[PDB]
Amino acid sequence: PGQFGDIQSRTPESKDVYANTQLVLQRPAAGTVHVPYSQAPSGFKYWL
């Protein structure tokens, strides 16, 4: 989790994808009609 290769593919056209990110949902509140979730940290955008 939280590393480049959290998501993985064998080709640029492989539809089969490996993922390890833990998009863990959270509780929405009164009026807050949306979906609250644990953000998956990227691999690239800090690995850059």
Partner: protein, 105 residues
């Protein structure tokens, strides 16, 4: 100049003459231009970004912009433990202290 209650005009002195201008004439900034909420009497209430200075201006009936600045360093204090960004979807309900819009205190 006749003790009015309008949301258009505003008094300013000129050589023993109260003259009128518009609320769109005034403008406030510290780094970016602020946003204006409370307009009454001698008193103007805004919310404004992270401040080094303050600048206030308005424009004349002769359209000459009188705009002058005041030295004051503005930092909003933090609430909680997080030097945060703006008000998000996820909020925990932590106490704070704000002015209200009661025009007669």
């Amino acid at each position: 100049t006749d003790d009015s209650h309008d949301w258009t005009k505003l008094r300013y002195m000129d050589s023993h003459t109260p003259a009128d201008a518009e609320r769109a004439g005034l403008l406030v900034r510290t780094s970016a231009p602020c946003t204006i909420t409370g307009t009454m009497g001698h008193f103007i209430l805004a919310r404004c970004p992270k401040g080094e200075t303050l600048t206030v201006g308005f424009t004349d009936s002769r359209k000459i912009s009188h705009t002058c600045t005041h030295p004051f360093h503005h930092e909003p204090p933090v609430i909680g433990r997080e030097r945060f960004h703006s008000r998000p979807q996820h909020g925990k309900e932590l106490p704070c202290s704000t002015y209200v819009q009661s025009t007669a205190a």
